[PDB]
């Protein structure tokens, strides 16, 4: 079976790497505003519907092609989504929108065992993102893999809190602590990147794009073989868990010092090593349209002792080296601007290993 | 669990009944042409995109409301889809179209055990048909049911044989015998009504709307608990199996005399009683925009000894009575025009009984 991955660290054999081509700035709607820093709100307001800066995209394209060359050198088979113009305006009976990109396979695809799952998504500009990946998925399906598409939401107004009182990220953090997010519990929705795998146990967070119904759908669909746990953090990342709590080995996890886990004691009791990475050194003047500087810890493990890490982030490279983990440095400074690091730009399709429990 | 149905005959407790409101004539595209009699091709050519005759719809509405009253009298809980204007024109990145209706729950939903499955569909005018049923499905999901949506096709040109050489139904029957259908094997597609359930065994046919990839997806998704078998017939119904091979009890099936099953011997060997119903008496001048006169055998079983049958079709009523099966006669002559009989207009959500094998 070409598809087989139970965790984030077993020896990597095949991976899907996103594309930066034709990425479009999403219209500035309520859910986009709730998942981005205010510094960029006017950019979205103005550039909405247009391509991200083409000079910047060209650099990202170059960085990602090099990343793929390195992956191939490290013995990994690389598949890429189909090139698509994301500027096309589509219209469902519930809304109309232009697209985003197919830069982050981690946001839409998650592999659990021999099954590839397409997440529903929660942004109107990402409704048809799955189209870029169908050629690959059908190929794996023809080769024996299980293929699942979680229920696609209508993304009607009822799914969003149109009047979400966010005027700054600080407001968002407070609302979030109150259990208030831009997405309601109207219908299931989730981004696959809000889930992180550790064999029989999968961890998820309720975020601005992943609601409890979405998590419950995953929990119910995967039981009894897998257990989906809900964890939460202080001042959480609006969307996606991999730059907050990145599991890098059996019983080893990188925990973002700025977003501590409320359930950290569950992990300590299981005898897990919680590593807090050093701060990112990325320039504050560098544009990060989505996500934050913590992309430095959004690493991808080639195996337990080999990590693909940002070439510029020396301090975290040192941390890994002191732990006896070989650093494969790759520069994706411009690709970072699109909202992701190594874990985000990929979806591990096949890792060599079996299903096991690490929480004991 | 509100959802629990393993076959077509156990004591019925809850059912979804379609709506005739706002039904629109689908644009006359290649897949519509391949699933309709030539007599009506000019109607589709002219009325495409407009509402079906409103005077006719009004009569169908009345007939269906009465059917629901009767179901309630027979102790069955009835749920109905949400009223929606099907004339809305939508646009995906692959095509643009107006909708059809939510008259036939059997075409889009199938219940296997405690799981409700939304079929992908194969017609561009039925891409967003699932929207009418989400309120119901979310309610069952909240109440514990498993919910699955098979992979939604792009329905791009590649899925269809644009030059399907059909000039008459006779041509279609020949092509079909050659294994040539309007849909290719480009991506999975299927209508749930091409499947019929008998406990651990589910039977399906490759039709103009259900391809082998679609059947394989179902087979792979349901294994190992259920076995999906592929059967075929002479001069088959272009879409849907329930007016061709309608299983009405443990080891009892109605087999359309005009469309004999190529694998009938498998059933004889299992000791199944194959009943061939008498011919339909419906007037040839009555408009049947979709399907055929064989809607008479498209019965719905309330239990092994109670069948909901067309009030006008006396000959088949007699056949059931001689078999000791109580006939609940309901007139849906005008609703028939939309393309379905009792089995088509409903989706059995809950029947009282357990999972069993009848093929031995």
């Amino acid at each position: 079976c070409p598809v087989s991955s139970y965790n984030e660290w077993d020896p990597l054999e095949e991976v899907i790497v996103g594309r930066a081509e034709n990425a479009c700035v999403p219209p500035f709607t309520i859910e986009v505003k709730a998942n981005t820093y205010e510094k960029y709100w006017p950019f979205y307001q103005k550039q909405g519907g247009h391509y991200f800066p083409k000079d910047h995209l060209k650099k990202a394209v170059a960085e990602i092609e090099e990343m793929c060359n390195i992956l191939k050198t490290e013995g990994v088979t690389v598949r890429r989504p189909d090139p698509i113009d994301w500027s096309l305006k589509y219209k469902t009976p519930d809304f109309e929108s232009t697209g985003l990109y197919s830069a982050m396979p981690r946001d839409i695809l998650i592999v659990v065992g021999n099954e590839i799952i397409e997440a529903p998504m929660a942004w109107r500009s990402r409704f048809f993102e799955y189209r870029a990946y169908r050629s690959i998925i059908k190929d794996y399906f023809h080769r024996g893999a299980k293929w699942t598409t979680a229920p696609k939401p209508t993304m009607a107004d009822e799914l969003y809190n149109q009047d979400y009182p966010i005027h700054s990220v600080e407001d968002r953090h407070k609302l979030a602590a109150q259990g208030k997010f831009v997405t309601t519990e109207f219908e299931p929705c989730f981004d696959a990147a809000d889930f992180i795998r550790a064999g029989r146990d999968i961890f998820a967070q309720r975020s601005q794009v992943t609601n409890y119904l979405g998590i419950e759908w995953m929990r119910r669909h995967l039981a009894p073989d897998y257990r989906v746990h809900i964890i939460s953090f202080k001042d959480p990342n609006p969307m996606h868990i991999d730059a907050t709590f990145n599991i890098i080995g059996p019983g080893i996890v990188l925990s973002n010092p700025d977003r501590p886990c409320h359930q950290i004691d569950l992990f300590k009791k299981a005898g897990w090593t919680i590593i807090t990475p050093p701060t990112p050194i990325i320039p504050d003047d560098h544009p990060l349209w989505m996500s934050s500087k913590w992309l430095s810890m959004n690493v991808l493990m080639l195996d337990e002792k080999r990590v693909m890490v940002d070439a510029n982030e020396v301090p975290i490279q040192k941390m890994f080296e002191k732990l006896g983990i070989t650093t494969i440095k790759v520069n994706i400074r411009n690709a970072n601007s699109l909202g992701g690091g190594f874990h985000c730009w990929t979806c591990d399709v096949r890792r060599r290993g079996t299903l096991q429990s690490y929480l004991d």
Side-chain angles (χ1 to χ4, degrees), chain A:
Chain A
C1 183
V3 179
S4 183
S5 182
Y6 301 100
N7 53 59
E8 313 294 342
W9 59 81
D10 282 342
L12 185 63
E13 300 187 343
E14 187 157 340
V15 71
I16 292 172
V17 177
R19 282 192 176 280
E21 281 92 354
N22 299 312
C24 292
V25 182
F28 200 58
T29 54
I30 192 64
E31 84 281 20
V32 172
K33 177 177 179 187
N35 284 105
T36 53
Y37 285 102
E38 326 95 280
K39 178 184 175 188
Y40 305 101
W41 292 356
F43 165 76
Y44 283 101
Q45 287 169 159
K46 177 54 210 66
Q47 293 304 297
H50 295 74
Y51 291 107
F52 273 92
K54 286 190 175 180
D55 52 284
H56 195 114
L57 290 181
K58 214 183 164 186
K59 296 174 192 132
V61 167
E63 292 167 357
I64 300 304
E65 287 308 314
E66 182 52 21
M67 178 183 154
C68 295
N69 291 333
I70 291 167
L71 281 166
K72 287 138 188 175
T73 285
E74 293 296 314
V76 181
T77 297
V78 176
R79 300 290 303 263
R80 307 293 296 291
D82 292 335
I84 278 174
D85 178 17
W86 297 100
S87 70
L88 179 151
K89 186 166 202 156
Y90 46 87
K91 181 188 180 61
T92 76
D94 302 285
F95 69 88
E96 190 170 17
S97 185
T98 42
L100 186 58
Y101 52 37
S102 65
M104 316 298 164
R106 192 73 58 178
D107 289 358
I108 178 172
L109 307 175
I110 180 167
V111 173
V112 181
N114 306 309
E115 176 181 14
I116 177 148
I117 302 170
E118 298 186 21
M121 305 314 284
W123 282 20
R124 290 179 171 178
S125 60
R126 308 189 75 171
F127 192 97
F128 286 109
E129 196 154 310
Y130 63 86
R131 286 181 67 249
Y133 302 90
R134 287 288 169 85
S135 295
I136 297 168
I137 297 168
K138 293 187 297 185
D139 177 54
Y140 293 147
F141 182 71
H142 285 106
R143 296 198 270 148
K146 294 176 71 179
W147 172 16
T148 289
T149 55
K152 204 75 195 167
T154 58
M155 292 188 194
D157 295 337
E158 293 86 320
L159 180 59
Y160 311 98
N161 285 118
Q162 313 296 127
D163 45 31
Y164 195 55
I166 181 186
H167 302 98
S168 67
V169 165
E170 264 208 43
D171 298 357
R172 197 221 291 132
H173 283 146
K174 191 185 175 175
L175 293 168
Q178 303 171 61
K180 295 173 176 186
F181 301 92
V182 75
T183 49
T184 65
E185 294 295 333
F186 174 69
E187 60 190 336
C189 70
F190 67 89
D191 273 14
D194 271 314
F195 298 75
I196 189 112
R197 305 162 295 133
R200 290 203 173 263
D201 298 284
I202 298 172
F203 302 87
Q205 67 163 179
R206 200 288 194 221
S207 67
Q208 300 291 341
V209 301
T210 291
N211 61 192
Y212 292 113
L213 257 184
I215 291 170
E216 179 58 27
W217 185 84
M218 272 289 267
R219 193 206 65 79
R220 198 171 302 170
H221 173 76
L222 297 167
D225 306 85
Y226 299 84
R227 307 158 233 152
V228 174
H229 310 258
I230 302 175
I231 54 182
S232 53
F233 312 87
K234 173 192 187 174
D235 300 341
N237 201 260
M239 63 182 189
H240 314 149
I241 207 173
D242 57 345
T244 298
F245 194 82
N246 196 177
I247 306 180
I248 60 163
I252 320 153
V253 60
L254 266 26
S255 170
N256 188 139
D258 291 357
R259 304 168 186 147
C261 181
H262 296 133
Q263 304 69 209
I264 199 55
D265 257 77
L266 153 82
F267 300 102
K268 291 197 291 187
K269 286 168 167 56
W272 281 30
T273 302
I274 296 82
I275 300 304
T276 97
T279 48
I281 59 180
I282 192 163
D284 301 81
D285 73 296
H286 185 63
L288 289 177
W289 299 305
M290 282 173 260
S291 196
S292 69
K293 62 176 180 173
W294 281 107
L295 286 177
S296 51
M297 63 167 281
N298 190 51
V299 302
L300 171 72
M301 302 298 293
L302 301 209
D303 66 43
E304 289 182 39
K305 292 303 191 175
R306 268 193 298 150
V307 61
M308 185 167 290
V309 57
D310 197 275
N312 310 94
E313 297 289 342
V314 172
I316 196 176
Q317 286 167 205
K318 295 311 179 181
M319 176 205 82
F320 287 117
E321 291 156 16
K322 292 181 207 302
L323 279 167
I325 293 163
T326 303
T327 57
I328 296 165
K329 315 163 198 62
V330 181
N331 178 26
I332 56 170
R333 173 67 62 79
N334 292 92
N336 276 353
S337 302
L338 291 180
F342 303 100
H343 197 255
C344 289
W345 276 88
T346 58
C347 171
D348 54 310
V349 167
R350 189 172 63 255
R351 288 183 179 275
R352 194 171 59 255
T354 58
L355 178 51
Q356 296 175 272
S357 182
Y358 308 101
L359 213 49
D360 304 286

